[PDB]
Amino acid sequence: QRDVNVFKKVLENIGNAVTQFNNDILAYTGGDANHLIHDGDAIIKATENGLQELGPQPPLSLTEALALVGPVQGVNKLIMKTVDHLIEKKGPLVGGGYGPQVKASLQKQAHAAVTLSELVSSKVPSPLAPISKQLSDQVAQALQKGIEAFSISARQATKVKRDISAFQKVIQDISLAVNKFNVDIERYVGGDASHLLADGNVLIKATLDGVQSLQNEPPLSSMEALALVGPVQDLSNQILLAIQNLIDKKEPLVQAGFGGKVENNLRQQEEAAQKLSELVSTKVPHELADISRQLSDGIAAGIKKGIDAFAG
Amino acid sequence: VNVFKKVLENIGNAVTQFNNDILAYTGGDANHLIHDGDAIIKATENGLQELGPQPPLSLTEALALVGPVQGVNKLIMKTVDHLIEKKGPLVGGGYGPQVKASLQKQAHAAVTLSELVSSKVPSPLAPISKQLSDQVAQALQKGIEAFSISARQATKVKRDISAFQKVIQDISLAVNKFNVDIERYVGGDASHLLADGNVLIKATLDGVQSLQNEPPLSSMEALALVGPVQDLSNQILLAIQNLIDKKEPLVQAGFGGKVENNLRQQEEAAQKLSELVSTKVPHELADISRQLSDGIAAGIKKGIDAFAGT
Ligand code: NI
Ligand code: NI
């Protein structure tokens, strides 16, 4: 009947929102993270809009509830996935400056979601309540796991690691192989073509070697995988994040009384950055100057804030 | 006088747009560039239609119209240069004949325009005008003949891009080293953190020192450190294209069978690799990985078809 097909609709909408959020998260390599926040807000709003429309709905039938089991489960899993994705892209957002906002958003979501769950209990019949409660728990707990991880940073240390060194090496080799003959032919006009053939063979061999190499190597995590695809960006993000972390742990380093030591170090770092960024600005092209500035400036400015925080 | 000036301005704008487009183009779909070129050509043509009926300029009028023409020409030259610089990726994509055609068309139109303009200017300023025209046309040719058939501009293999890589990697290591310790630390002695910071600073300094005497980096040369995955792909495609092009005279020399087998082997290798790669990709990147890999495999296939039994 139509009485059931409104809650269902709401659920679907929520799921869609969640999916959108997930997509956004996936997209976000770094930089401006307003969009993600906006998405989160939208999702929250959508969730809220459920409460307003589900409040006056009647008590469901025994057989009606079981049709509604699948939709909920589907939603919950999706939500969990989204949360996981968000967690995965913790660092860059943090670096950008967007950790408090995100934390807030998650909390808000939890608060809304919890409310929704509470509401839904009284609409379902009382013998399905065990399932429903469990489902709710699965959601809320999951949400918390994100929220908790984005808010205290207790055991949150991002494991420094890179067997990205060997993938990179392989890539380099491949490039060399290509450029090795990609000249040879380009040069070639006629006569014996033995050389070209040899080059091709060599390239093939190289490729084979590369394949062999990446046989036992593990998968690549998306934030970790952007190291090799997006090499400089990752570095930038990880610098920013580091800076943010440092800023965060000012209070209890001032408490331990290292503050002066810290400040000097920060200053030194800033100086180094200035030195490097100047040199860099010399080595860039027509086209890529603007972006180069954009990163460097961000870095320098990021440093500055930290310095301000920890000076004296 | 106004109308001609306006036309010139429009042309300049078009050229600028084209240049911008070229700059943007990392590779992939290159339709847009072609479209831009076409538009530019059209614009140029539209000059002829509006400048034909214009009267003969005065002695004093011509000299005001010297500085704008010059500005235009330089811009055009720059655009051409930029286009040339982004030769390889376009070629790889498959867009080399079209581009060549476009350039030729532009030259033809531009030439016509130049011819037209001679008769509107007075005859004692013709020495300058002709020179200006020549500057353009020659420049255009440099890319146009610049752009088809090959065997002259062979991008030299160059990989000082190593040192930069090393530097960046080092920096990353330094950062990720601190950014772990900091994360860990709750309080107490903070010496360690300070030490880490110092180390990082030192590393940075070293990096700076390193890239002191190293040269500039050319845009396409430079997109190898920022988009390594993509540069490799493009260079591969380009290479394949080149190979395809030089089938005729390798069939003429009669290596064709040898070539074909080699191609097949290469294809096989690609297939092998691309499968493995498909295992190591994540949530989000799979799609792109497919997109490149598929392109590569398909690219190979065409070449194979071309050179099989020939
Ligand atoms: Ni996942
Ligand atoms: Ni230039």
Side-chain angles (χ1 to χ4, degrees), chain A residues 84-85, chain B residues 283:
Chain A
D84 284 349
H85 294 159
Chain B
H283 292 110

Side-chain angles (χ1 to χ4, degrees), chain A residues 259-260 272-273 285-286 289 298 300-302 306 309 311-312:
Chain A
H286 307 96

Side-chain angles (χ1 to χ4, degrees), chain A residues 85 154 157 167 181 185 188 190-191 193 200 207 218-219 225 230-231 242 252 256 272-273 285-286, chain B residues 82 151 154 164 187-188 190 197 215-216 222 227-228 239 249 253 269-270 282-283:
Chain A
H85 294 159
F167 294 94
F181 81 131
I185 65 96
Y188 176 77
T207 60
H286 307 96
Chain B
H82 283 169
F164 294 85
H283 292 110

